[PDB]
Amino acid sequence: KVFGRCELAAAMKRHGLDNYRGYSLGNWVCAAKFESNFNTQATNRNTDGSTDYGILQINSRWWCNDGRTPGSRNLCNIPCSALLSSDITASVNCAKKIVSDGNGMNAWVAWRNRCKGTDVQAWIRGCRL
Ligand SMILES: [Cl-]
Ligand SMILES: [Cl-]
Ligand SMILES: [Cl-]
Ligand SMILES: [Cl-]
Ligand SMILES: [Cl-]
Ligand SMILES: [Cl-]
Ligand SMILES: [Cl-]
Ligand SMILES: [Cl-]
Ligand code: NA
Numbered sequence: 001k002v003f004g005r006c007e008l009a010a011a012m013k014r015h016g017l018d019n020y021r022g023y024s025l026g027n028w029v030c031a032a033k034f035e036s037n038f039n040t041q042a043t044n045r046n047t048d049g050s051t052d053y054g055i056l057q058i059n060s061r062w063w064c065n066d067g068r069t070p071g072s073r074n075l076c077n078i079p080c081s082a083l084l085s086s087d088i089t090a091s092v093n094c095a096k097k098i099v100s101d102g103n104g105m106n107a108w109v110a111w112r113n114r115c116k117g118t119d120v121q122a123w124i125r126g127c128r129l
Contacts, residue, residue, distance in 0.1 A: 026120030
């Protein structure tokens with residue numbers, strides 16, 4: 001599914017991610033925008049052979065099982081396919097684990113490079129939330 005901007009904000013707030021670990025909803029929408037362009041079925045292979053899945057490009061090296069990433073872990077205890085659903089519940093609950101791991105949203109390199117410090121409230125501007 002390709003969500004609209006405000007449609008994803010709303011879905012993220014429905015699933016408890018607005019201000020989760022102090023990160024306002026705009027930070028989540030901005031990370032989603034640059035990780036997947038709001039597309040739940042986005043997949044991208046990494047140099048190391050892991051793959052990133054879904055709207056927040058959650059990596060198989062640590063978080064999900066895809067059966068083809070050697071030596072990896074599955075700390076969200078889910079198949080990576082679950083992260084490609086039109087229903088973002090499995091992406092949101094795994095993203096809550098990821099942002100709690102120590103380095104906040106910096107786990108998402110694209111949020112550090114493209115969202116951190118900017119006016120992320122622009123991403124929820126005008127949305128009925
Ligand atoms: Cl947009
Ligand atoms: Cl915000
Ligand atoms: Cl694997
Ligand atoms: Cl393969
Ligand atoms: Cl594991
Ligand atoms: Cl699995
Ligand atoms: Cl949803
Ligand atoms: Cl933090
Ligand atoms: Na894995």
